[PDB]
Amino acid sequence: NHVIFKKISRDKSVTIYLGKRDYIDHVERVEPVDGVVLVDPELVKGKRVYVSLTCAFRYGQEDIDVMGLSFRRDLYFSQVQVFPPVGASGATTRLQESLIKKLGANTYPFLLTFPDYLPCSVMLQPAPQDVGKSCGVDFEIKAFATHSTDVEEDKIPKKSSVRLLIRKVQHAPRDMGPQPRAEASWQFFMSDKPLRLAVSLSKEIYYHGEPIPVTVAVTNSTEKTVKKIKVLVEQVTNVVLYSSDYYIKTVAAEEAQEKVPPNSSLTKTLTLVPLLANNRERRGIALDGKIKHEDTNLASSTIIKEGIDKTVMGILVSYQIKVKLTVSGLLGELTSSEVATEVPFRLMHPQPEDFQDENFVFEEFARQNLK
Amino acid sequence: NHVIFKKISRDKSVTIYLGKRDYIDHVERVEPVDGVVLVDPELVKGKRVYVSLTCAFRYGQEDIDVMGLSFRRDLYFSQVQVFPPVGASGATTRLQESLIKKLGANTYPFLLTFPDYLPCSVMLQPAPQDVGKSCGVDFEIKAFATHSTDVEEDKIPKKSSVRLLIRKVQHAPRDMGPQPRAEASWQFFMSDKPLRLAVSLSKEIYYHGEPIPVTVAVTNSTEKTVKKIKVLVEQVTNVVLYSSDYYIKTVAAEEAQEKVPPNSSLTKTLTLVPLLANNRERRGIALDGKIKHEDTNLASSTIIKEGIDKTVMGILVSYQIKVKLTVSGLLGELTSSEVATEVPFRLMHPQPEQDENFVFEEFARQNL
Amino acid sequence: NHVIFKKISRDKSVTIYLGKRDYIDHVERVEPVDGVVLVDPELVKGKRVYVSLTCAFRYGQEDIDVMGLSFRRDLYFSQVQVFPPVATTRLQESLIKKLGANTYPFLLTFPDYLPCSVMLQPAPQDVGKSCGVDFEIKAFATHSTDVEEDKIPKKSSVRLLIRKVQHAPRDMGPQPRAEASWQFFMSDKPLRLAVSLSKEIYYHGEPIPVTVAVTNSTEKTVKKIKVLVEQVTNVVLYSSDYYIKTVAAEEAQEKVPPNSSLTKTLTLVPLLANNRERRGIALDGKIKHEDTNLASSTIIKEGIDKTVMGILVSYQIKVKLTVSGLTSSEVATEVPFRLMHPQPEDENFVFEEFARQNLKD
Amino acid sequence: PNHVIFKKISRDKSVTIYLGKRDYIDHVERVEPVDGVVLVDPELVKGKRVYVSLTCAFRYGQGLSFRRDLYFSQVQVFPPVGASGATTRLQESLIKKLGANTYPFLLTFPDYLPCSVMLQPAPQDVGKSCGVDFEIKAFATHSTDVEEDKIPKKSSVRLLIRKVQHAPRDMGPQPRAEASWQFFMSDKPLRLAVSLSKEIYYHGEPIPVTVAVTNSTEKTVKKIKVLVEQVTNVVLYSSDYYIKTVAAEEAQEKVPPNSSLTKTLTLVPLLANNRERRGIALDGKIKHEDTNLASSTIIKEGIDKTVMGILVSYQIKVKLTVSGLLGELTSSEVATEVPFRLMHPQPQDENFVFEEFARQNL
Numbered sequence A: 001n002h003v004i005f006k007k008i009s010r011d012k013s014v015t016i017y018l019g020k021r022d023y024i025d026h027v028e029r030v031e032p033v034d035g036v037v038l039v040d041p042e043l044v045k046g047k048r049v050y051v052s053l054t055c056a057f058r059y060g061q062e063d064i065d066v067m068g069l070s071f072r073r074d075l076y077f078s079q080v081q082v083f084p085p086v087g088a089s090g091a092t093t094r095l096q097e098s099l100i101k102k103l104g105a106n107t108y109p110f111l112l113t114f115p116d117y118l119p120c121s122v123m124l125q126p127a128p129q130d131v132g133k134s135c136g137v138d139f140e141i142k143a144f145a146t147h148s149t150d151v152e153e154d155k156i157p158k159k160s161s162v163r164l165l166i167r168k169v170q171h172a173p174r175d176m177g178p179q180p181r182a183e184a185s186w187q188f189f190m191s192d193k194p195l196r197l198a199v200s201l202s203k204e205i206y207y208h209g210e211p212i213p214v215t216v217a218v219t220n221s222t223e224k225t226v227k228k229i230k231v232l233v234e235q236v237t238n239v240v241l242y243s244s245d246y247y248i249k250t251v252a253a254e255e256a257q258e259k260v261p262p263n264s265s266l267t268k269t270l271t272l273v274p275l276l277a278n279n280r281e282r283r284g285i286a287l288d289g290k291i292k293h294e295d296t297n298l299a300s301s302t303i304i305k306e307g308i309d310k311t312v313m314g315i316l317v318s319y320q321i322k323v324k325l326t327v328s329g330l331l332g333e334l335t336s337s338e339v340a341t342e343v344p345f346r347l348m349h350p351q352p353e354d355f356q357d358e359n360f361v362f363e364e365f366a367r368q369n370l371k
Numbered sequence B: 001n002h003v004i005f006k007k008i009s010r011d012k013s014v015t016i017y018l019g020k021r022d023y024i025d026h027v028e029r030v031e032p033v034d035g036v037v038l039v040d041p042e043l044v045k046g047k048r049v050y051v052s053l054t055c056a057f058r059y060g061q062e063d064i065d066v067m068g069l070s071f072r073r074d075l076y077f078s079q080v081q082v083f084p085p086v087g088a089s090g091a092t093t094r095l096q097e098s099l100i101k102k103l104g105a106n107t108y109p110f111l112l113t114f115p116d117y118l119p120c121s122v123m124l125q126p127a128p129q130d131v132g133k134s135c136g137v138d139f140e141i142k143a144f145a146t147h148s149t150d151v152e153e154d155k156i157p158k159k160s161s162v163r164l165l166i167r168k169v170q171h172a173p174r175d176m177g178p179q180p181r182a183e184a185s186w187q188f189f190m191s192d193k194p195l196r197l198a199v200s201l202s203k204e205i206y207y208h209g210e211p212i213p214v215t216v217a218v219t220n221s222t223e224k225t226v227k228k229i230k231v232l233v234e235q236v237t238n239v240v241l242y243s244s245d246y247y248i249k250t251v252a253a254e255e256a257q258e259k260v261p262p263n264s265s266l267t268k269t270l271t272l273v274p275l276l277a278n279n280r281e282r283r284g285i286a287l288d289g290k291i292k293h294e295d296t297n298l299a300s301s302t303i304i305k306e307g308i309d310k311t312v313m314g315i316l317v318s319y320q321i322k323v324k325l326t327v328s329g330l331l332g333e334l335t336s337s338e339v340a341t342e343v344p345f346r347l348m349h350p351q352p353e354q355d356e357n358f359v360f361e362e363f364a365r366q367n368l
Numbered sequence C: 001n002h003v004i005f006k007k008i009s010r011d012k013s014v015t016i017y018l019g020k021r022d023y024i025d026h027v028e029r030v031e032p033v034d035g036v037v038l039v040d041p042e043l044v045k046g047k048r049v050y051v052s053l054t055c056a057f058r059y060g061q062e063d064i065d066v067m068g069l070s071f072r073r074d075l076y077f078s079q080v081q082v083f084p085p086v087a088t089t090r091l092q093e094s095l096i097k098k099l100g101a102n103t104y105p106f107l108l109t110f111p112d113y114l115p116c117s118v119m120l121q122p123a124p125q126d127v128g129k130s131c132g133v134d135f136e137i138k139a140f141a142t143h144s145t146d147v148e149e150d151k152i153p154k155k156s157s158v159r160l161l162i163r164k165v166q167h168a169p170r171d172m173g174p175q176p177r178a179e180a181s182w183q184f185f186m187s188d189k190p191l192r193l194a195v196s197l198s199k200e201i202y203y204h205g206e207p208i209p210v211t212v213a214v215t216n217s218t219e220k221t222v223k224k225i226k227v228l229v230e231q232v233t234n235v236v237l238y239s240s241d242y243y244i245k246t247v248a249a250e251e252a253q254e255k256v257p258p259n260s261s262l263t264k265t266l267t268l269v270p271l272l273a274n275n276r277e278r279r280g281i282a283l284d285g286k287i288k289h290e291d292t293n294l295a296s297s298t299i300i301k302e303g304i305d306k307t308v309m310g311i312l313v314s315y316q317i318k319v320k321l322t323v324s325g326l327t328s329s330e331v332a333t334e335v336p337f338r339l340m341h342p343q344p345e346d347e348n349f350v351f352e353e354f355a356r357q358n359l360k361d
Numbered sequence D: 001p002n003h004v005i006f007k008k009i010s011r012d013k014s015v016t017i018y019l020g021k022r023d024y025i026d027h028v029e030r031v032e033p034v035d036g037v038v039l040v041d042p043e044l045v046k047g048k049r050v051y052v053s054l055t056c057a058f059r060y061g062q063g064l065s066f067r068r069d070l071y072f073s074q075v076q077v078f079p080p081v082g083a084s085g086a087t088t089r090l091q092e093s094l095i096k097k098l099g100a101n102t103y104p105f106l107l108t109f110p111d112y113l114p115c116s117v118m119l120q121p122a123p124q125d126v127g128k129s130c131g132v133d134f135e136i137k138a139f140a141t142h143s144t145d146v147e148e149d150k151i152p153k154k155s156s157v158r159l160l161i162r163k164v165q166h167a168p169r170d171m172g173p174q175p176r177a178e179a180s181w182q183f184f185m186s187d188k189p190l191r192l193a194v195s196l197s198k199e200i201y202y203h204g205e206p207i208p209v210t211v212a213v214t215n216s217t218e219k220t221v222k223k224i225k226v227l228v229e230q231v232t233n234v235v236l237y238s239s240d241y242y243i244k245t246v247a248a249e250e251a252q253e254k255v256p257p258n259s260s261l262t263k264t265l266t267l268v269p270l271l272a273n274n275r276e277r278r279g280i281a282l283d284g285k286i287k288h289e290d291t292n293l294a295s296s297t298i299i300k301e302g303i304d305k306t307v308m309g310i311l312v313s314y315q316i317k318v319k320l321t322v323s324g325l326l327g328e329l330t331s332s333e334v335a336t337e338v339p340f341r342l343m344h345p346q347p348q349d350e351n352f353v354f355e356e357f358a359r360q361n362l
C-alpha cells in the first residue's frame, strides 16, 4: 500500500497529491518532487493553475509568509503550469501515470526539480537562555489558481491555493571520509608528566538512530587521578544569514564508571545515540522540522558543495564527539580551564535504495503531533 | 584620556576591566596585571567570582581529514578571589581606586603578578612549505563565577566567565650599560689568497622599527671578483617543547649588484628595518600575536635567564644579519660560488619610562 | 686455550691483535683495550703507526629515491703511537714473545661517561632511521708527508668494531623487590592490581618471576590478564625517535570474578631468540651477527646529561587486564626493572679472524 | 647519407653475416632486436642447414673457470623458412643490394638481461677477469652419415655485439644528501649538503655537483674533494667488489670557522680520464677504441639481481679535509655519497658501405 499525501484548497477548486512528505538529498543528486493536481473543472473555468517549489531562509518568525518576519532570503524558486494542460500533458513518472488513472481526467502532472546548491531542512527555535530568534530553511510546494479581471489585474486568491511544507532530508553519499581520530596531551603546571587522551570512532558518517562507539584511551603518567570521563555528542549551529547566532548543545552524553589512577592507562568504548528523543528540551537545537511534529529529528550535518558560498546554506549544522576528563587537584588549584578534545563526524540518514499499478491509500499531508 | 579595556560574560553577570592589552617584561621585573571585575549582584547571588592568570604553550592545528593532534603545557597558573571581597590581591593601585570610583559599588579589584621564568608572547602559523604545526605561548586573564555546587562537580559555567588574551611584550631593561658594536671578520682563502669580510653593527640591541646600519667591508686580495653582496635580517625560530621544529626566514633584505674586483676593497653601509609590514607572507615567522590582528609585530628576541632551562620558553626566537657574497670563479667557468656569515643581534621594544578621565573600549583587538 | 682476534691491513703493512671482541663496563670502571700491532718493518720504513679508540653515535640509512640524510657525533676519541715505540699487561708481554720482535703494545682506556653498545634498525611500520653507538679500534700508518697534508691511506689501516657490554657492578647493595600497586575504582568500588618482581636487576637469560595480585571488589569480571616484558628505546641525539616493543609475553585466559582475588606468578625471559622480527628493537650489535643480544638498560651516571648516551634503553613489566562492562575495558600498568649481564669475576694462543659469525639459518 | 653495414665471412667462404650495427640499444621499455641477413654460397651449402644464434653468457676466469648462460635463441636462415621475405626495411634493402642467396634473420632480446659489462683486474685487485658477452653466430650443419649431424668451425662466423644501455623516457627524483658531524669536544656541527641537477647523466655529459658546507665549528675545512666513484659487484661465482675513482675535482676554496660556502664543481666520468683501464667495469675490451665505462645496471621488478652477473653503480663522493682533526680528534674521513645513474642518451632505400665487423684498436 503506497500512502499518497493530499491537501485541498479552501474553495475545493484545487487538490494537490504528493508521493512523499520528505524528498531525499544524497549529495550526488536530489529526488525531484513529482505529483498531480486534481482541479474541479467548473471552478477553474478560464483560470491558470501553477505549482511552485520555493526554498527560503527566514529569521524572526516561525514561517516564511508571516506579517513582519524580520528577514527572508529566497535560496531557490521554480514554477510550472498544470492547467490548462502543457504539451502532451502525459506523466513522466509511474507514480503520476498511476495517480492520473486512479483519480480521473481532471488530474494533471507536475515535476519540480531541486538543484545541488541548496541546504537540507534545518530550523531552530531558541530556548529561554539563548540570545537570537527563531530561524529556518523552509521548502514550500504551492499549487495556486490565477484569473483575470477586466481592469487588467490578475488575481491569486489564497482560497484557490494549497501550500505543503515538505522536508529536503540528507541521506549519505556513496563514499565517506577517513576514520575520525584525535590525540591530545596536557602537562599541568608543576608537572613533568603528560596526561594523554586518544579518541577514535568506527567511521566518519553515522545514521540517525545508529549507536556511535567512541573508543577512549587515557594514558595517565601524572600523579593525579582522572576522576571522571564524560563523552558528549555536541551539535554546533551557525546561523550565517542576517544574524551570526551560534549554538553548541549536548544532544547525547555518557559518563564512564571507570576512574584512571596515577601511572596507569584505561582503554574503553562508550556508545552514544544522538536523538531528539533524548532531549526533554527540544528548543535551542537545530531540527529538520517543527518541535510539535512527531516525524521531526535532529538536523543532519550540512554538506557544503565545492565552490558554493556557505552563506547560501543559511544555517550550518555540524556534530562532534567531546571527551572531557575531570582531573583531581586541578580545577581551582592548577587551571581555570577544561581538559577536553573534540572529534568531528557527520550525522545523516542511511544511503538510499539501489508491471501493474500500486494500491493507493490517501492521507492528509498535515504531519502528526506528539501527545 | 586613559583608555580602559572591558569585556562582559555571555550572561552579563561578570565584566572585567584592564588598564592595558599588553604588559611589559623589561627583564629586571614584569608589570603585574591590575584590574577590576564589575559583578551584577542579582546574577552572582551566593556565588564566588575568581580571576586566573594562565601562561600556556600550545602545539597543533585543525586540518580537515588530517588526524587531530594537540599538546598544551601550562607554564604558569595563578588565581585570586574578587567576589565576595577578601582583599586576595593584597593591596591597591590608583587605577583600581579610580575605576572603583568611576564604576560604582559591585566593582572589586584583582592583582595577578607574573614571575621571572616565563617567555614573552610568541606564536607561529606555518607557511605551506613548512613541516611542523601552529604553536604559541598564550597569556589568558579569565574572570569566572562558581556556585557552591560547581566546585564539587567541576563544571564552571562558560556563560558566567570572560577570558582576555593579553600579550607579555619584551622591552629592554634600564641601566642597560654602554654598548659594544656587534662585529666579526672572516678570511676566506681562495687559491691561498684571502677574501676578507668584516661585518659591524652600531650596537647589539635594536628596537622594533629602528633602522639597523650594517657596515660591510670586503677586502679582495684574490684573483676572483665579488659579483654580488646580499645583506639579510634572518629570524631563527626553535620550537623547544613537544616538537623540535626549526624556521629561518628573511624579515628584511638589501642586495647591491656592486662588485669588488681582484686586488681591491669595498666598504658599504646598508640600513635594514625588520618589520612584519615588509612581509606579504605573515606565516612561517614568529609573531607576538595573531596574523589577523593589526597590533601584531615580529616576536622579540627570547631572553633566557641564568639557571632557567630554555625548554620552558616553549619557542626560542633570535635574529642575525646574514651577509652573502657571490664570487665569480675563473673566466669561462659556467658557475660561481657563494660564501656567507652571520652577526647576531637582539630585537625588542624600547626601555620603559587626582583620578584620570577613562574612555572604555572592547578588549577585542582590531583586524587588518 | 686463550683465543686471540687478529685482522691485517689491505697492504699487509699493519696487523692488529686483541684479547677480546667485547669489553666489560661494570659501572665502577670499564675494561681497557690492551692489544699489540705487528708491523712489516720493510713497509713501515720511516712511517708512524697509531691506534685510535673512537666511540660515535650515528643516525641515517640508505633509502632508494629518499633524500640521503646522515648524522655522526664522536662521543670519545683517543689515540696512542705504537711504532716507532715510545705499563704493560701479561697478554701483551705473552703476545710479543709468541709473535716476534716487530710486535708493539697499545693500551686505550674508556672513560665513565660513555654509553654501551646499542643499535637499532627500524621495522617497516616504524618511523625513524637506523642509528647506533659504535666502538672502533683502528690501527693506521702515516708517512712523514701524511702529517703535513692531513691524509691517512686506507690500505695501511685496519679497523675492528668492538662492543662495550654492560655488566652489573660487584659488591652491590641488596635489592628491594620492584613492586607497585594500583586501585582502579569502577562505580566507586576498587579493582586492586599489585605487580611485584623478586628484585630490581635481572641478567640476560635469567627468568623474571612476575607475581600479579588482582583483588576484584567490583561487580565486573577480569576476563583476561596479559603480562609483557616491554623494551622502551628513546633516541636522544639528532631525532627524538621512540620505540616500545614486546620482547616477552604470557597471556592467561584466567578470570577474576566479582568479590574475589587471584594471585599468579608467571616467569618471562626477555631474549632476542624469542623475536622472529629482530628489527625495531635496541640490540648490542648487528641483526646478522650470532653473538648479538638485546641492549642492556642504559645506566646514566650522576651529572652526565642523558643526551650523550645517544640511545636510552629501559625495560618494564606491563600488565594488561581486560575487564567486562555491560564490550570490555582494558587497564594497564608498568613496573620498571634493569636488564644487564652478570657481575664480572704464558697462555696457549689460538688465532682467529675478528669478523663475528653470522646466523647459519 | 651512407648507412655502414658490418659483415664477417666464415673461413670456408660458405656463410657471410651482415648486421646493421655493432651495438643494440636497451632503453629499459624494450630492447632493439638484431635484424641482419646471411649470404650463403649455394654450391658450398648444398643439402646443409644454416642457423643464427644469439647467446648471452656470464664468464669468470681466463677452460673459462666459470660460465653461466643468461639467454640462448636460434633461428634457421637456410633452407629458407616460410615466405622467407624480410621483416625490416634494412633486411629488404640488403636482400635487394646483395642478391638472391641472401636470407633474413631476426633475433629478439628479452627484458631480463644485463647490458655489456666486463672487467679485467688491476695488479692490486683480488679476483679474476669476468664479463657478460653477447654472441651472434651464423653456422652450417650437414650429415654425411645417418648417425650424427656435424657443425664445422670453418662453416661458422661469430660476432661479439654490445647490448648498450640508453635512458628510459622517465628519470628518478633529483639526487640530494645532507650529512652533519659533531667532532669530540665540539658543541657545534659541520654540515654538508650535496645536490645534482638530475638523477640520470649521459656518458660525456658534465655533472654539476653543488656542495653547501655550513661550518659552525672552530676548525677550518682546508679542502673539498668531489669524486665520481664506480662501484662494481660481481654477483655470480665470486662476490668480488671494486670501488674506483673515474673522475675527481678539488675546489680551491677553504671554509673558515663560523662561515658557509656553496660551490658547484663539474665532473665528467670518462674512460679517457683513466690511464689505468683495468680494475673498472667497461662495456667492452680495454684494447678497443669504442669501449666506454659500463652504464649503471638497471634491475627490473621481480628479476633476481644475480642473473645480471655484474652490478655497476655510480655515486658522487664529497670529502672534507678539516684542520686540527686528523690525528688529534679523529682517525676517520669526513665524506658523504649521492647516487646517480650513468647511461647513453634517450634513443627510398639507403646507400650501403660494407666494413669488417672487427672493432678498431687504440
Ligand SMILES: O=P(O)(O)O[C@H]1[C@H](OP(=O)(O)O)[C@@H](OP(=O)(O)O)[C@H](OP(=O)(O)O)[C@@H](OP(=O)(O)O)[C@H]1OP(=O)(O)O
Pocket: B163, B164, B165, B290, B364, B365
Ligand atoms: O570561540 P572560542 O573557542 O570560545 O574562542 C574564540 C576564539 O579564540 P581562540 O580560538 O584564540 O581561543 C576567537 O579567535 P578566532 O578563532 O575567531 O580566530 C577569539 O577572537 P579574537 O582572538 O580575534 O579576539 C574569540 O574572542 P572574542 O570574544 O574577542 O571574539 C574567542 O572567544 P571567547 O570570547 O570565548 O574568548
Ligand SMILES: O=P(O)(O)O[C@H]1[C@H](OP(=O)(O)O)[C@@H](OP(=O)(O)O)[C@H](OP(=O)(O)O)[C@@H](OP(=O)(O)O)[C@H]1OP(=O)(O)O
Pocket: C151, C152, C153, C154, C155, C156, D227, D245, D248
Ligand atoms: O681519488 P684520486 O684523485 O684518484 O686520489 C686517491 C687518493 O689519493 P690522492 O688524493 O693523494 O691522489 C686516495 O687517498 P686520499 O688522498 O684521497 O686520502 C688514494 O688512496 P689512499 O686513501 O690509501 O691514500 C687513492 O689511491 P689508491 O687507489 O691506491 O688507494 C687515490 O686514487 P688513485 O688510486 O686513483 O690514484
Ligand SMILES: O=P(O)(O)O[C@H]1[C@H](OP(=O)(O)O)[C@@H](OP(=O)(O)O)[C@H](OP(=O)(O)O)[C@@H](OP(=O)(O)O)[C@H]1OP(=O)(O)O
Pocket: C159, C161, C355, C356
Ligand atoms: O667497506 P666498509 O665501508 O669498511 O664497510 C664494511 C661493512 O661495514 P658496514 O656494515 O658498516 O657497512 C661490513 O659490514 P656489512 O656492511 O657487511 O654489514 C663489515 O663487516 P661486518 O659485516 O662483519 O660488520 C666490513 O668489515 P670486514 O670486511 O672486516 O668484515 C666493513 O669493511 P672493513 O672490512 O673495512 O671493516
Ligand SMILES: O=P(O)(O)O[C@H]1[C@H](OP(=O)(O)O)[C@@H](OP(=O)(O)O)[C@H](OP(=O)(O)O)[C@@H](OP(=O)(O)O)[C@H]1OP(=O)(O)O
Pocket: D158, D160, D285, D357, D358, D359
Ligand atoms: O679464440 P678465437 O676463436 O681465436 O676468437 C678470437 C678472439 O675472441 P675471444 O677471445 O673473445 O674468444 C679474439 O679476442 P682478443 O684476442 O682480441 O681479445 C677476437 O678479437 P677482437 O675482439 O679484437 O675482434 C677475435 O675476433 P675477430 O675475428 O672479429 O677479429 C676472435 O676471432 P674468431 O671469433 O673469428 O675466432
